[PDB]
Amino acid sequence: KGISSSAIPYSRNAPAWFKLSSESVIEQIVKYARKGLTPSQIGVLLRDAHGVTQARVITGNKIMRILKSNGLAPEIPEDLYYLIKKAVSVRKHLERNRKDKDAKFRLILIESRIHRLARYYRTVAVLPPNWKYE
Amino acid sequence: SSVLADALNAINNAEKTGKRQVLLRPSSKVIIKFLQVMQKHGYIGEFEYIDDHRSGKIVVQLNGRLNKCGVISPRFNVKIGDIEKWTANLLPARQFGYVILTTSAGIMDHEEARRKHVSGKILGFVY
RNA sequence: GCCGGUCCGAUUUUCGUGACUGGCCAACGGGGCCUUUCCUUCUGGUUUACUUUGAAAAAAUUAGAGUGUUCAAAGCAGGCGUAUUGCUCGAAUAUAUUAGCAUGGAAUAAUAGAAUAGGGUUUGGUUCUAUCUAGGACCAUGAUUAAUAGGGACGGUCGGGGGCAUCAGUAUUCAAUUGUCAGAGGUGAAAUUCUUGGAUUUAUUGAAGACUAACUACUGCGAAAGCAUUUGCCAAGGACGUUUUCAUUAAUCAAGAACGUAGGGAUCGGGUGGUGUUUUUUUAAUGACCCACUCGGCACCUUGGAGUAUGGUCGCAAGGCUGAAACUUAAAGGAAUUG
């Protein structure tokens, strides 16, 4: 395989060319959340809107705990919801034209990769069990 | 894998090749105290634990004196009246080399183990 | 330990000592105090595997011990006195533990585990200052790091990856219409076949299905079989980029399921930097080549058998001019034949 990832630096504080307060970032991220944007998109729009590194550095904690604190939690986590959305999209395309055997293969693979994460989420019990992908 | 076994395999085959400074990426405080007691015995030179937050890396400036290190992957209980059997089964002689055990102070060799009069499980041998 | 001072004597400064005093400085230790800030959540009405123990431990059991059974195999003495409160000695030495009785301390490997995250309601209603305030209740929340472990977002891309439409090419076959005349085909030679109702060839078309010449390489993709015209749609995927998120979600495979040793050069895809030509400029977009670095790819180059022999066991060329024998026998043959 290959490596391509971020390299979060050695410092663990706000990078001191910052010229902005702490709760203003909280207001910005709850504003984007009430606009209805997913947490990873909050993270990139906060990397580029005003110069934060990420919220665990600039605020006191991560965006998932700060959105659960501000009351805008997601009922299912990001990767779970995105794999479900990809699964239903490729299922809709295959039911448009059933001859796509590569889409059948990829639907089986996405079903496996979502049942693995559903097994993890049920065994850690952060979503309510009986949840087994419809 | 076993991080201690792969670390000691790293410095073992780097010594077998004949390098001087060996990088050793996955570190832990067991490996720290392991090769701390082996540098007390003077089997390597000094070393360094570069601390980045994810795992920390190890660089050892070993000179020439190792010929084989290693671990034993079943870390079983070994009585005081059995380390003599284990030295005779692991090393080429009695006092030539060591075998370090995990015990109630922790990274002693067998000389210091019989001195302090404790024992425990065997985690690695070095000679 | 530093320094100032009450003094005695010398002095009108300063020193000797004996007292005694405080101002301060370091080393020791003692008693408290702050690091449980002031405010919300219990089961119901930290423990376990290592080292030292004693207790009961089966004679026999281990090993040991002194003794001239004449030695040894075996057996097992305390004897003297001062045979009168004592000597010189030996059955002193060494397992009943895998199982237990319970005790006592820390690394590893497990089992636990913090009663944190409010200085978050819409309303309802009480009194108390000279329209501003005070004090009551209901109504919507679960431990650090971010592996060159993993999956997910996002971005410019990337491919002859897939599915569905669509576009094309000249071939091949067939048909139509022209043209001119004896051959056309086919092979090593032929032959079959077709042909004056014009075969082959020529030209203008039209239809049909299949395939994608050259480009094509030690290059690209896909899990694999495989995958090469254009354009569009539908989804997917890979690498890279990333100061984005989650927090061990990982790997390995029965059953099942879908489809059928180290080094160097070059190249493809992505990114960074350089600074010349291609480029060009107020329409949008962000190309090519070179050089360095870097990540990932398809790749490359260099370090028991062999023989032989067989009086055995089993099969067998074995055995003679056929015809042809009970028959010296024909015809026809093979034989050698210059009769």
Phi, psi of A121 (to 5 degrees): -70, -35
How many domains is chain A partitioned into structurally? 2
Q: Which nucleotide is nearest to A53 (CA to C1')?
A: C243
Cα–Cα distance, B3 to B10 (Å, whole number) = 10
Cα–Cα distance, A41 to A37 (Å, whole number) = 6
Q: Is residue A91 part of a domain?
A: yes
Domain region containing A95:
74-134
Torsional sign, CA A109, A114, A119, A124 = positive
Structure tokens at A102: 């590569």
**Could you tell me which of A26, A114, A107, A103 has the C-alpha nearest to residue A72?**
A26
Cα–Cα distance, B110 to B101 (Å, whole number) = 7
Q: Which residues of A touch B51 (CB under 8 A)?
A: none
Distance A1 CA to C218 C1' (A): 24
**CB-strand contact A16/C, under 7 Å:** no
Shared-domain flag, residues A85 and A30: no
Q: Strand, helix or coil at B98? A: strand
**CB-strand contact A128/C, under 7 Å:** no
Distance A58 CA to C35 C1' (A): 27
Cα–Cα distance, A85 to B126 (Å, whole number) = 55
Q: Give whole-number Cα distances, B15 to A125, B7, B25, B109, in Å.
A: 49, 12, 16, 22
Cα–Cα distance, A52 to A25 (Å, whole number) = 9
Shared-domain flag, residues A90 and A64: no
Shared-domain flag, residues A50 and A66: yes
Cα–Cα distance, A29 to B114 (Å, whole number) = 63
Q: How many helices (H) and strands (E) does chain B have?
A: 4, 7
Shared-domain flag, residues A23 and A58: yes
Cα–Cα distance, A112 to B9 (Å, whole number) = 36
Shared-domain flag, residues A38 and A50: yes
